[PDB]
């Protein structure tokens, strides 16, 4: 042992009670009621939604929702590349206990269907450009009966629209400031159901995300509330860090400034003109970044941080990009789909070259011997093990594949290759 066994700190905060739901809904209230707070911005289309607009939406999708006959006994599809509307529906449900599978919008068909084989929709939200596919996919699975389009305002070719879906379901004199979202049991309802890494079904009830949110506002582990903060984030949504950071950075009040296809001048006109704080990149545009002549050209200096996870970052383009931006270092953080967030997380300004951060509160981490099971010492090597409240509660009607990953006792395998130091950050270790 126990003294080779990382506990999580203290959350700064204690954990409120709750579903993911009602914890949104109370926060995203309290925004919408001081008008012109941005909660999302395109960058591409330079387009602002509010929290007013964004939180009146979602209430009155999940209201609509609600009243369509959708409940914990149902799940939504949401497959859409990352926009204004996309977290609508995603807020939506969750206010209601309508599990959620986020479906990557650049599957093709057959990924498609594998991927809603297993969540097996009831209704499903859909961009213009992905119509077509889902329509591909409910002639096959017809359990999709309803479809709804997400960018327009309108029908669209035969369809409804969110706008027009929630019309035809609200009761007259519907008050967007008098609803009250669902209250249900947050450890056995899903909030998510997200892909695997042949894909799987990953469920997560709500008390995941509730940890998650506890983490997000952390000051230590998350980042400090403070009005007029901006994150220009180019994850994709359909993805546990998109998903994740994204719902704590609404739960912040923060300015989401979004984009979809990379471009080099509009990241870092963004990062400028957007006065972004913190930016999220996928590891591939790091090693874009370590790249780039062009950053010196823009005005950065308030840019804190520049975040990184869901993948191998080195120490060698870490240090790169850190020194193209003139940045102490990289903000790191290591989590996978099964794991909800990043159980382990760069403390803020505790920055170390190679690491990828300390035990999240609320977990534990241990290394052990790839050979045997028992728990190894500082700096060495062995398997990189966790438990805590973020876990998945398994695989969608696959347990064996879920036993497979959690003994009886409850660790988490990551089946990555881990050390901790003498100051307890972690290291992963690339096996090749
Ligand atoms: O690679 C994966 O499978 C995915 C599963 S979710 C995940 C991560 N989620 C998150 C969520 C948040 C962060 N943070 C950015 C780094 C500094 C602040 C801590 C949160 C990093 C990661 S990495 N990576």
Excluded at 184 to 199: E, G, H, Y
Excluded at 392 to 415: F, Q, R
Aim: glycine share 8%; with cysteine.
């Amino acid at each position: 042992d126990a003294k080779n066994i990382k506990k999580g700190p203290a959350p700064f905060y204690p954990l409120e009670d709750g579903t993911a739901g009602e914890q949104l809904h109370k926060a995203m209230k309290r925004y919408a009621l001081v008008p012109g707070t941005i909660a999302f911005t395109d960058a591409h289309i330079e387009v602002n939604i509010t929290y007013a607009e964004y939180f009146e939406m979602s209430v009155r999708l999940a209201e609509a929702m609600k009243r369509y006959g959708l409940n914990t006994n149902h799940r939504i599809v949401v497959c859409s590349e990352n926009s204004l509307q996309f977290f609508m529906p995603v807020l939506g449900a969750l206010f209601i206990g309508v599990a959620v599978a986020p479906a990557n919008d650049i599957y093709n068909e057959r990924e498609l269907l594998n991927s809603m084989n297993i969540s097996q929709p009831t209704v499903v939200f859909v961009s213009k450009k992905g119509l077509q596919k889902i329509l591909n996919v409910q002639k096959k699975l017809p359990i999709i009966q309803k479809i709804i389009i997400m960018d327009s305002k309108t029908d669209y070719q035969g369809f409804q629209s969110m706008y027009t879906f929630v019309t035809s379901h609200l009761p007259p004199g519907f008050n967007e400031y008098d609803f009250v979202p669902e209250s249900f049991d947050r450890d056995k309802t899903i909030a998510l159901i997200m892909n695997s890494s042949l894909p799987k079904g990953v469920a997560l009830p709500h008390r995941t995300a509730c940890v998650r949110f506890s983490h997000a506002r952390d000051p230590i582990f998350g980042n400090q509330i403070i009005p007029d903060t901006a994150i220009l984030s180019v994850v994709p949504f359909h993805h546990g860090f998109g998903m994740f950071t994204t719902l704590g950075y609404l739960i912040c009040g923060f300015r989401v400034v979004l984009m979809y296809r990379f471009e080099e001048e509009l990241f870092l006109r963004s990062l400028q003109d957007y006065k972004i704080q913190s930016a999220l990149l996928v590891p591939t545009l790091f090693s874009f970044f370590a790249k780039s002549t062009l950053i010196d050209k823009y005005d950065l200096s308030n840019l804190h941080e520049i975040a990184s996870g869901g993948a191998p970052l080195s120490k060698e383009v870490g240090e790169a990009v850190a020194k193209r931006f003139h940045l102490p270092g990289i903000r790191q953080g290591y989590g996978l789909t099964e794991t909800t967030s990043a159980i382990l997380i760069t403390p803020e300004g505790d920055d170390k070259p190679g690491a990828v951060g300390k035990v999240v509160p609320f977990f534990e981490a241990k290394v052990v011997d790839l050979d045997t099971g028992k728990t190894l010492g500082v700096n060495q090597r062995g398997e990189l093990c966790v438990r805590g409240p973020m876990i998945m509660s398994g695989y969608v009607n696959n347990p064996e594949a879920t036993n497979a990953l959690i003994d009886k006792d409850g660790w988490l395998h990551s089946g990555d290759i881990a050390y901790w130091d003498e100051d307890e950050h972690f290291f992963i270790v690339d096996r090749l």
